[PDB]
Amino acid sequence: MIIPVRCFTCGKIVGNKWEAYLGLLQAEYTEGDALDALGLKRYCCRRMLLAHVDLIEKLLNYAPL
Amino acid sequence: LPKDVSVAELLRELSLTKEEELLFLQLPDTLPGQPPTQDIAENACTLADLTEGQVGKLLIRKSGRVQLLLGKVTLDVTMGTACSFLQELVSVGLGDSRTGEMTVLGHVKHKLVCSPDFESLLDHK
Amino acid sequence: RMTVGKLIELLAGKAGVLDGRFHYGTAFGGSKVKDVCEDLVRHGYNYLGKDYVTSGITGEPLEAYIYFGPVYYQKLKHMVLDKMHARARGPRAVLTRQP
Amino acid sequence: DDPVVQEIDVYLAKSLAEKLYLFQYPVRPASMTYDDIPHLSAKIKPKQQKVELEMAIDTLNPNYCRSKGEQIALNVDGACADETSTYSSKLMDKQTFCSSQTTSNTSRYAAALYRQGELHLTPLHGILQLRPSFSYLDKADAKHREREAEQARQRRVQSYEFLQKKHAEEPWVHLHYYGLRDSRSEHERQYLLCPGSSGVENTELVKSPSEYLMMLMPPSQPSNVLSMAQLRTLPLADQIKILMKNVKVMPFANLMSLLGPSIDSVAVLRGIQKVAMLVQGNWVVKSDILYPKDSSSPHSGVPAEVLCRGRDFVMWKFTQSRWVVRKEVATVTKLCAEDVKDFLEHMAVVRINKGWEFILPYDGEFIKKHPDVVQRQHMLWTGIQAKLEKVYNL
Amino acid sequence: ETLEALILKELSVIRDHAGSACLRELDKSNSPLTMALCGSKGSFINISQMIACVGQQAISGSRVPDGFENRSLPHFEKHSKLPAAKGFVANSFYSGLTPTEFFFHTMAGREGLVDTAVKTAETGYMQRRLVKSLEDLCSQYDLTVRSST
Amino acid sequence: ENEQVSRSQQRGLRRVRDLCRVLQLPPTFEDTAVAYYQQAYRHSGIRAARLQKKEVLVGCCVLITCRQHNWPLTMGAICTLLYADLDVFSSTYMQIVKLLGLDVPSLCLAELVKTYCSSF
Amino acid sequence: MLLFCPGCGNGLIVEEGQRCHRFACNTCPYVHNITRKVTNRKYPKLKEVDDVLGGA
Amino acid sequence: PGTQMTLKTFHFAGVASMNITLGVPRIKEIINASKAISTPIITAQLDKDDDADYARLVKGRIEKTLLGEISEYIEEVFLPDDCFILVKLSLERIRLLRLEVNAETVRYSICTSKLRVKPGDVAVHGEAVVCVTPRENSKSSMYYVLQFLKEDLPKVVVQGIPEVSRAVIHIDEQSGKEKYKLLVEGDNLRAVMATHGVKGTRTTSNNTYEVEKTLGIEAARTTIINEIQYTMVNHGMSIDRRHVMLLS
Amino acid sequence: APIPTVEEKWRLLPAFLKVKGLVKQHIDSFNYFINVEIKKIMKANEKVTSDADPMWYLKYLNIYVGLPDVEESFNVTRPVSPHECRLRDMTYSAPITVDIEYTRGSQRIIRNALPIGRMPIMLRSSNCVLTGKTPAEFAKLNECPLDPGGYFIVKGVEKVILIQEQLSKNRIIVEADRKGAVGASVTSSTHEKKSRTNMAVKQGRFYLRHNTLSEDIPIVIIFKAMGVESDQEIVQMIGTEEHVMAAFGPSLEECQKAQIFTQMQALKYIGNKVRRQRMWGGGPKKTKIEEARELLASTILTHVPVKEFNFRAKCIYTAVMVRRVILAQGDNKVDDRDYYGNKRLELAGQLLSLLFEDLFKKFNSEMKKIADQVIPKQRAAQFDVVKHMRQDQITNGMVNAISTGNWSLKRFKMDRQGVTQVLSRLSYISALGMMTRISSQFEKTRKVSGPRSLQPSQWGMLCPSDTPEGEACGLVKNLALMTHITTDMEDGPIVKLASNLGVEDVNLLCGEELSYPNVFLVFLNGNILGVIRDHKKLVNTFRLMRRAGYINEFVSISTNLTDRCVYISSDGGRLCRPYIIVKKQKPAVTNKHMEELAQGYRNFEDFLHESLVEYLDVNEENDCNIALYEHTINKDTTHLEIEPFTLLGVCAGLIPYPHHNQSPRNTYQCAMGKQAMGTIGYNQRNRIDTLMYLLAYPQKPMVKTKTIELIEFEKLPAGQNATVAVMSYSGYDIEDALVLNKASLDRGFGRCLVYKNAKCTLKRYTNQTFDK
Ligand SMILES: [Zn+2]
Ligand SMILES: [Zn+2]
């Protein structure tokens, strides 16, 4: 649904880095170099950012509003 | 006993033997023509609707291939099933309203099958 | 159970999360072991996934290398909270006086 | 593999077209013939063709058990009644063969009297299968049995009794049989030929092989929806619209191969300008074609008019340069990344460290051939550019 | 049947030789080798299947029968009695399987599952009848087994 | 009970059933209609009546039924499915409502418009 | 072997006449005296194989 | 063990043939004490267990052999004077299987439950030639009943126990010495024991009911114990003999 | 010199999924039903006329199904979204309109739009409001764009008609009995009747057994009654091989034992052996002279037609049956029921057609009964059909049949159970897998262990490793990723082309011709078209015509050399799978064609038309040879497999590297994935189901199969990627146990939500009182 705040294994703050991440993918940037720019050395944070699905926007499209 | 092929059949019955023979053949359902002013819709143009005179050409090709050029189209002729029983071709001449001449004409020894070369029609277009 | 597929999936997943790709495990094909091994060695990890690991309890390194990797776990519907059941005296049936 | 031997003339005859029947006995091998058995009677119904033969069977031959013959003749008829006796004598005088009908139609079957190198054909009026009848046994059984002794909607059509009554109405036609030894047989045999010249062009059988295939095999009669075979049946202008809709970026040369070389260049160049707009020497379908006014964005739902402005601005950008920045488009168009991605995917391909590049190479060859069209599109772009500049405030 | 037996023996000895080569080549401290040596889980057969070669996939003690006419699968020719054409798996689990090999292995697995599924109910009925019959027998203090009567 | 249902009462309740069925009404309407019919059939003068009387009684019963649970239905639409004339139907309706005195809500114009406008 | 009557197509049977034994038809007086010997070999398949057992 | 038994196969039991119903169904039979069982196995010992010729001789002695299996050819012969059926025995196959069968033996085998054919009907002209001439029994019997005889004349039994279907030699692969046992898929232990050259003292069976009716209840109990233990071992799982002894 | 490989060959798979695939079977079947079959059924019963008072009639003219609508408004209808029907516990259906004409008072009055019931409307069908809509419209209608659809909604529950797998009708089945005696059976099934007849050899002579007959009759007596009387014809017609006469001799001796030599005698014998199975008469009929003839004409071998009491074709068919029995009695080549060449699939369309036809017949019969009761007696009050068009009949019948899942059609005597199942909404993949489920005809009739096995015939049509573990293991199957199901055909041009191609009419020839080795028979869906020589020429020409489009591509032709027959299968319900054609060791597909497909120049149908890719049936693929890869292609490779990974089903598609795993593990994984915990759809928040499970932080898999991309599984994931360490720890993970990290659980890993509905009803009773 929404990006988790903390990495499951290590626990680094990853919630805030998600939005700018989409900005990086908004430009020409690839996935790996974007993750390097965000500063995700270990692969657990990279996994969490990469594998996430932003279902929250699709659900909000169905919200009452 | 050997099982003959059209090339062998016609070769033996023409070259080795000069005696005329009675054949029976099954044509396709419709012939490559149109009923001449017979009130036709691409309906069944059978042998009956045609007229007298030369109607087709039979070609014995090399390698045993036998074909029947019927104008622009070329049908393929094959052995039918070899019937071993008695098949006699008779004529029923109804000379009078209550009289008829049963006229046996001859035995039927071989049966032929004619079918369109659908492969030729397809690769044609 | 001879589920070598799990080991191959773990290796491929580690390689993918290291290089930011999505390796394919398509039947009768997919990414091969050599490619993920090259991806792992390029990023600075052991080419077979096994890593040098220190025990959390003792603080001493483990004698044998351990096999880390990200794998896809799916939770199941069967949960203990629904399956747990205990029965006291409780009710009985009118015809035969049994639970 | 030429017709190496016996180019054989084939003729058609009609002297006995209505008089020709093919009789076959499934139980009698071709070795034995009925040319030696003197026949007695032949009863036929011309309509509902059902022949019935009766031929004499000899008794003085050693193969007749006259003791059995006397008993069977005694059973079949009365002891001395004889008013309607199947066999005149005290023996079984004759044998009766009944017939069965093979097919309703006999048009496709032909009799071929093959002469010395020439072939003659004749259509068949009918084919009947003859089997020895055993009705005399049933007659004997019947004689023995007689001696011992506004309605609701029905369906008599499917009733065998009414069928028998319908067949019972036809009067029997007695016939004189003539065997193979009869000179009348030979005299009627020669009529199987046809008097005609050796070489005459047939007025009939002129149909083309394609026409023959058609007549023997008669017909029973995404937004892409239609296949190419269905596509080619549509009018040329519609074909251009649908094809260009399918690909949305398509070089002019390929369109000639897609439609076919049989279509004139000007007519193709005439229709394509209605629905396709030129970018860098390549034709791109207009935005309104992909987005009808009643349609909206599948991802955001914005009306097609907004999509028309956004897509054209991206399309207009490719005229200026080969590279388009994805982020700048979203900033100018205020559209979501999903809709922006859809426009670029249709006509651009991602390039690392460069943004998006036009999917097709700059086709100057088409530009050189038709400078008049190239100029025409330029004024159209200026009109389009004027619309966007006042809208997006470039 | 003689040909089938000869082919089965040849393929089995191929698998056994490959497994022996595997075991000889393996180094000590290898996890599957350790787990098979102490007998905790698995055997050398499993190691050979995962490394060297999966053996012939036998259904009811025989090679794969011809589901189609004279052919196990359409991918092989008529009346073909080749090893792969009748069920043998040349590849190992590490190397992965080809579609025919995978199909035959699934054949064997489904055979095993069906056998287990029927055997459970069969043994249940056996047990209940037997316990109904033989429940009342007990050994008395005189060391003689006496019936209820 | 349920056995003292003469041929006439059975025919009447079956008519009520098929009438409320062809109208595509819920089962609650059928239940209420059959209950009202069984209640009206308790009078001696009602049971002893001609076929026209029983038919118009079925019509009035289904009308009252649909009337309570605020379903508008003009008498014309009901008589259109009855093998009788509306002139005797009205008289019998008045006779029975003068004898039974059940609640008869007023036909709502809003729902009548909602029902009738959609028919165009 | 199954002999059928050429006269009417029914199955001929064996019987004994006055001069010799004859094939006869049960429906028509067609008979054929057995003029000389007639044989119908069957050549039934034998028990060829022996199949001792105990091999490897 | 029924849970433990997985219904294994290829357990040819050293003979590469003779499919034997084992596993749970076998137990299902044994406890049921069914008079008729599937695949009844009878084990027989031979006095001269070394001679394969003797083994084949006794096998042919017990194994039921049909007339058709030994007759090289059968022909219906119709002659002007009479009609009959002739059969020529394959003396080659006869001495190949060394069955004590000749023209007189088959003649005596005939006249047994075959439309009560009389001894005068059959005659033995040559050593391998035998002829049979039927008559009109009038019990729905026309002379064309010859065909009927030709239908079942090969189906008469000439040598062997009628209930025995197939017997097989089985070598013993002991390195010290080689012995020949004899397996019989029959239903008559008494007949097998009665036959010459068979160590009837040491012959066993599989049908518990047959053992009971032939040798006594104690032999039946021993056979039950042995059968259960054999089926049990064949599946690798083990039970102490005391349990099965108590059950028996 | 390795063969060049079209690496983008897999691009064919998405394009195929554009036209057909997972759910398109159900949707196409239902649309074909509601657009053709309903009108055909109306045509079947167009006129009803009362026996009493003739000149009165009711004629149906045309029928329509309209749009899905709700009748909550007082005599007013309104469009309703399927989600609304889900919420209010109502059947998402549409009114069924019909136009009629009738004579109330000897005056013709017609109606234009008269309702007769309500037809449930399957989601995403032709009439369903969801079809042809944008995702924004789906959001406005509160529905998931990724919802497969293909299921009915009744009383608020989602029900799916499981695809029924059954034995193909009108085919000769030769098989041994319990006693080991080899016999024959055919289940000649038509709309008029579905009766099976059997052939036994119990005493070395053949008897024919049928339910309608008191005792099995020797077959020669049947032939004698049947039109053929000379024994020579029958013997020639069975077979002329010596062993054939040897086997057939006892039957001839038996028939000669009785004195049957005339068709009359045999008909009398049959009539004596025929029982008075009185249906609804027994007076107007004749006797052992007419009943026997009619029993021969219709009941025995119904599918074999007699034009007018001319049984010659049926004689040929039964002679072929007897020859098959005799030949199979030698080399014990026995048919196996699991070979899908003899299997057929019934979708929602066929079942709903049967149910609707029965309901329509019963409704018309009820209307006739009412008319007959009231028309002749009441008064000059002219009776009219309109006053009694009881609407609830059809609607209630359909609703009950769909909801309860048991189907009783007395007209076909068929009583099925569990036809429909409640769509399990545990996960999106569970919904898809259940959407592509197949049931078996048995429903556990007997634990034979034969059909439960995975026979090779299932290759490429059913997922091999996807079966429900348990009592249904091997009795419930799932369709493969890439497969298609045939629909019923017209059968006319097939006959025309066959006759033109040189097959000789069976009536023309005698039975002896069947014995010749080179002669081949041709069957059209179980009906004999005739005999022909040079079967290879016929097969090649027929296939070439099918490629050119003159013949429907789903019509399949196969050759059985063992029986020397040619089967032309055209009926629907056969399994078909696309394949790439190969001629002269080169595929018809070229990289240029894949480039065109990528550019959109052409679609899958274009490949079908240009003889590049053709469909294949089990029977036809039995003869042709197939290759799996370019390097595997040899000279005798007619076809090339499109993509091997389409062999696995949807559920098995989730398994990464399934070829590296032992198959029972794959089956367990299929069963587990059907029970995964994850999202359901974009409308899951608005949905109110009985039980729902949501994963708090679902993530798309790090390693994904191409099937995942095809079904867009990553759009609705059902798991999490977690860093697992393969080791032993604390000994708390002895048998399949596994430890978790308390910190990870605290940080939301594996967090799950359970949703349960609680619903109550407030009724107003027959008394004017209500629950408050
Ligand atoms: Zn992390
Ligand atoms: Zn005769």
Swiss-Prot record, chain A:
Keyword Isomerase belongs to the record: no
Alphabetical list of PROSITE patterns matching this protein: RNA_POL_N_8KD
Any one Gene Ontology molecular-function term assigned to this protein's record: DNA-directed RNA polymerase activity
GO BP, one annotated term: transcription by RNA polymerase I
Residue positions binding Zn(2+): C7, C10, C44, C45
Presence of the UniProt keyword Nucleus in the record: yes
Physiological role: DNA-dependent RNA polymerase catalyzes the transcription of DNA into RNA using the four ribonucleoside triphosphates as substrates. Common component of RNA polymerases I, II and III which synthesize ribosomal RNA precursors, mRNA precursors and many functional non-coding RNAs, and a small RNAs, such as 5S rRNA and tRNAs, respectively.
SUBUNIT field: Component of the RNA polymerase I (Pol I), RNA polymerase II (Pol II) and RNA polymerase III (Pol III) complexes consisting of at least 13, 12 and 17 subunits, respectively. Pol I complex consists of a ten-subunit catalytic core composed of POLR1A/RPA1, POLR1B/RPA2, POLR1C/RPAC1, POLR1D/RPAC2, POLR1H/RPA12, POLR2E/RPABC1, POLR2F/RPABC2, POLR2H/RPABC3, POLR2K/RPABC4 and POLR2L/RPABC5; a mobile stalk subunit POLR1F/RPA43 protruding from the core and additional subunits homologous to general transcription factors POLR1E/RPA49 and POLR1G/RPA34.
Family: Belongs to the archaeal Rpo10/eukaryotic RPB10 RNA polymerase subunit family.
Entry protein name: DNA-directed RNA polymerases I, II, and III subunit RPABC5
Organism: Homo sapiens (Human)
Gene name tied to this protein: POLR2L
Curated annotation (Swiss-Prot), chain D:
Biased composition (Basic and acidic residues): 141-149
Modified residues (Phosphotyrosine): Y191
Gene Ontology annotations of biological process type: defense response to virus; DNA-templated transcription; innate immune response
One GO cellular component term: cytosol
Localization terms from the record: Nucleus
Domain of life: Eukaryota
Cross-linked residues, Glycyl lysine isopeptide (Lys-Gly) (interchain with G-Cter in SUMO2): K390
Modified residues (Phosphoserine): S159
Keyword Ubl conjugation in record: yes
Kinase found in the keyword field: no
Keyword annotations of the record: Antiviral defense, DNA-directed RNA polymerase, Immunity, Innate immunity, Isopeptide bond, Nucleus, Phosphoprotein, Transcription, Ubl conjugation
Function comment: DNA-dependent RNA polymerase catalyzes the transcription of DNA into RNA using the four ribonucleoside triphosphates as substrates. Specific peripheric component of RNA polymerase III (Pol III) which synthesizes small non-coding RNAs including 5S rRNA, snRNAs, tRNAs and miRNAs from at least 500 distinct genomic loci. Assembles with POLR3D/RPC4 forming a subcomplex that binds the Pol III core. Enables recruitment of Pol III at transcription initiation site and drives transcription initiation from both type 2 and type 3 DNA promoters.
Name of the featured protein: DNA-directed RNA polymerase III subunit RPC5
Species name: Homo sapiens
Swiss-Prot record, chain E:
Known role: Catalytic core component of RNA polymerase III (Pol III), a DNA-dependent RNA polymerase which synthesizes small non-coding RNAs using the four ribonucleoside triphosphates as substrates. Synthesizes 5S rRNA, snRNAs, tRNAs and miRNAs from at least 500 distinct genomic loci. Pol III-mediated transcription cycle proceeds through transcription initiation, transcription elongation and transcription termination stages. During transcription initiation, Pol III is recruited to DNA promoters type I, II or III with the help of general transcription factors and other specific initiation factors.
Origin species: Homo sapiens
Recorded superkingdom: Eukaryota
Region Bridging helix, annotated ranges: 98-139
Full-length numbering of the shown residues: 746 to 894 of 1390
Name of the molecule in the record: DNA-directed RNA polymerase III subunit RPC1
Organs and tissues of expression: Expressed in the brain, in the cortex and the white matter (at protein level).
Taxonomic lineage of the native organism: Eukaryota, Metazoa, Chordata, Craniata, Vertebrata
Family assignment from sequence similarity: Belongs to the RNA polymerase beta' chain family.
Compartments where located: Nucleus; Cytoplasm, Cytosol
The gene coding this protein: POLR3A
From Swiss-Prot, chain I:
List of residues binding Mg(2+): D736
Cofactor(s) recorded in Swiss-Prot or TrEMBL: Mg(2+)
A GO molecular-function annotation: DNA/RNA hybrid binding
Enzyme's top EC category: transferase
GO CC field: cytoplasm; cytosol; mitochondrion; nucleoplasm; RNA polymerase III complex
UniProt keywords, alphabetically: Antiviral defense, Charcot-Marie-Tooth disease, Cytoplasm, Disease variant, DNA-directed RNA polymerase, Immunity, Innate immunity, Leukodystrophy, Magnesium, Metal-binding, Neurodegeneration, Neuropathy, Nucleotidyltransferase, Nucleus, Transcription, Transferase, Zinc, Zinc-finger
Subcellular location field: Nucleus; Cytoplasm, Cytosol
Keyword set includes Zinc: yes
Residues binding RNA: K169, R196, Q421, Q675
Catalysis: reaction(s): RNA(n) + a ribonucleoside 5'-triphosphate = RNA(n+1) + diphosphate
Chain's role: Catalytic core component of RNA polymerase III (Pol III), a DNA-dependent RNA polymerase which synthesizes small non-coding RNAs using the four ribonucleoside triphosphates as substrates. Synthesizes 5S rRNA, snRNAs, tRNAs and miRNAs from at least 500 distinct genomic loci. Pol III-mediated transcription cycle proceeds through transcription initiation, transcription elongation and transcription termination stages. During transcription initiation, Pol III is recruited to DNA promoters type I, II or III with the help of general transcription factors and other specific initiation factors.
Similarity comment text for this entry: Belongs to the RNA polymerase beta chain family.
Protein name, entry field: DNA-directed RNA polymerase III subunit RPC2
Species this chain originates from: Homo sapiens
